[PDB]
């Protein structure tokens, strides 16, 4: 039939040709965070993105992550709801990966994380739709394969000077505890998110928001 064991939200991950070493690390780092993602090989078309719908329908992944690297410098991330839905293009800045020295955070691979959204996401309709789409992706649905039962990390998304700041943190159990011992440590995923355009269709259709 259509599928067995229907998990609520599944993600399809593709990197276009021309992604750098750092950009590939971000994709692998992101894929490790979300176990409901299905990594795939490079897409030959830098312009014919309506094939991602056919990949998604085949793979039963309703959320597409397309990592577009143009001119070998500018990294863009396309997040869309695979059938129809809003396709929102973002620009990535200030990449920091797991292997970077400063970060020491540590969370269960696939453990369902707590999502925190800035209240500014509820101000604008486009900022709302981005929040709802981001929630439906990062929030690991129950029963997802490779997921862990307990909770060990929190993902924070905040809008500052129009740029979405994404920070991943790990909860620790402070020895004294007492006042809420969140004591979160930066996991390592650190980048600056910049919405560029939003399309009413799946990797296509007329633009509905322009930066």
């Amino acid at each position: 039939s259509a599928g067995f064991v229907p998990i609520k939200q599944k993600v399809l991950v593709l990197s276009s040709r021309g992604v750098t070493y750092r950009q590939r690390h971000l994709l692998n780092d992101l894929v490790s965070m979300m176990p409901h993602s299905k990594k795939d090989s490079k897409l030959d078309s830098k312009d014919r993105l309506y094939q991602l719908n056919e990949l998604a329908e085949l793979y039963n992944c309703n959320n597409i992550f397309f990592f577009e690297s143009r001119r070998r410098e500018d990294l863009y991330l396309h997040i869309a709801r695979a059938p129809n839905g809003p396709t929102v293009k973002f620009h990535v800045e200030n990449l920091h990966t797991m292997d970077e020295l400063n970060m020491t955070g540590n969370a269960l691979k696939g453990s369902r994380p707590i999502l925190s959204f800035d209240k500014t996401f509820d101000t604008a309709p486009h900022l709302k739709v981005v929040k709802e789409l981001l929630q439906q992706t990062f929030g690991i649905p129950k029963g997802a394969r490779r997921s862990k039962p307990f909770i060990d990390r929190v993902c924070t998304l905040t809008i500052a000077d129009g740029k979405i700041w994404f920070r991943n943190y790990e909860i620790r159990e402070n020895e004294d505890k007492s006042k809420d011992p969140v004591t979160l440590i930066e996991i390592g995923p650190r980048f600056v998110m910049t919405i560029i355009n939003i399309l009413e269709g799946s990797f296509g259709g007329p633009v509905i928001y322009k930066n």
Binding site: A2, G3, F4, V5, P6, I7, K8, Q9, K10, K38, A56, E57, N60, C61, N62, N63, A82, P83, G143, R145, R146, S147, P149, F150
Partner: protein
């Protein structure tokens, strides 16, 4: 919508056994699952003494017991490792299928116009004839 499901042949699955402590820590929603008691030391010693047919030496993370190939899995390994068709009844020699030449194309393949050389006497020979006539005039032939 596409339901975000999992087809029965998806390469992603839960519980991936590996080679050889037992990985009986917790389950989904976080509950310790009971450790299966260690097997009778007699029975474990027997299995070690005489390895089962298709002894893989693989334990699933949940149960400490080893995983051993069944008869059908042993057959599949037999065909795959000997490089034959992994299907017991698959025809590798189907009868010739003329899905294209089962009918006659009425027209010639080419629409190019017919040249006039094919209707006029040959020019290669007329050139040769004039060269021969020259050699006869000059006494060469």
């Amino acid at each position: 919508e596409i339901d975000a499901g999992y087809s029965s042949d998806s390469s992603t699955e839960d519980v991936a056994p590996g080679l050889y402590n037992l990985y009986i820590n917790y389950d989904i929603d976080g509950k310790k699952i009971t450790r299966p008691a260690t097997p009778a030391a007699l029975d474990s010693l027997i299995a070690s003494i005489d390895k089962d047919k298709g002894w893989t030496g693989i334990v699933d993370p949940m149960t400490g017991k080893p995983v051993n190939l069944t008869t059908e899995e042993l057959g599949l390994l037999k065909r795959l490792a000997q490089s034959e068709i992994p299907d017991e009844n698959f025809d590798p020699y189907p009868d010739y299928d003329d899905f294209f030449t089962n009918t006659v194309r009425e027209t010639p393949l080419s629409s190019a116009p017919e040249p006039k050389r094919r209707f006029a006497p040959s020019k290669h020979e007329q050139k040769r004839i004039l060269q021969l006539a020259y050699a006869i005039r000059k006494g060469r032939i």
